[PDB]
């Protein structure tokens, strides 16, 4: 309920026009302020994921339900732990060292496989964004 007041302030960032719903281009303008430039197609499937009624827009109750899914920077902290040289990439060498510290008796193949599980761009290392993708994956 105090939480609803905070979520109404949060919805207002997305709902520039204040009509009660978050359109696809409203998701686009906010994404663009964060430098991300997705296509109209990408914004549509992003909304469609959290569109219970399928009306194309996300209303305040739908938005509330999504926030209730579920601290969002805990991953930032974990990544900083794994990325030892602070270069922003988790090498398989760094992961191996971190697993050994936590007592994981993981072989060289298991470590390389973990790198390949989270390496989307295929650079051989897991950057922050790749780590956040793996941490926030249901």
């Amino acid at each position: 309920e105090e939480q609803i007041a905070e979520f109404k302030e949060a919805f207002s960032l997305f709902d520039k026009d204040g009509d009660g719903t978050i359109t696809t281009k409203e998701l686009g303008t906010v994404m663009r302020s964060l430098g991300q430039n997705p296509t109209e197609a990408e914004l549509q499937d992003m909304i469609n994921e959290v569109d219970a009624d399928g009306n194309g827009t996300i209303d305040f109750p739908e938005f509330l339900t999504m926030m209730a899914r579920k601290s969002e920077e805990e991953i930032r902290e974990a990544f900083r732990v794994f990325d030892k040289d602070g270069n922003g990439y988790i090498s398989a060498a760094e992961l191996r060292h971190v697993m050994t510290n936590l007592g994981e008796k993981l072989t060289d193949e298991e470590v390389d496989e973990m790198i390949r599980e989270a390496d989307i761009d295929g650079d051989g290392q897991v950057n922050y964004e790749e780590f956040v993708q793996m941490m926030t994956a249901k």
């Binding site: 902290e77 900083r80 732990v81 971190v98 697993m99 510290n101 936590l102 994981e104 793996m134 941490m135």
Partner: peptide, 24 residues
């Protein structure tokens, strides 16, 4: 990757923040 590694990594930072904050 294993919840074991992800939560362990967060616990290390927390021990860190703990020591650093204990320093005042």
């Amino acid at each position: 990757w294993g919840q074991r590694a992800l939560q362990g990594a967060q616990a290390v930072a927390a021990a860190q923040r703990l020591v650093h904050a204990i320093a005042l």
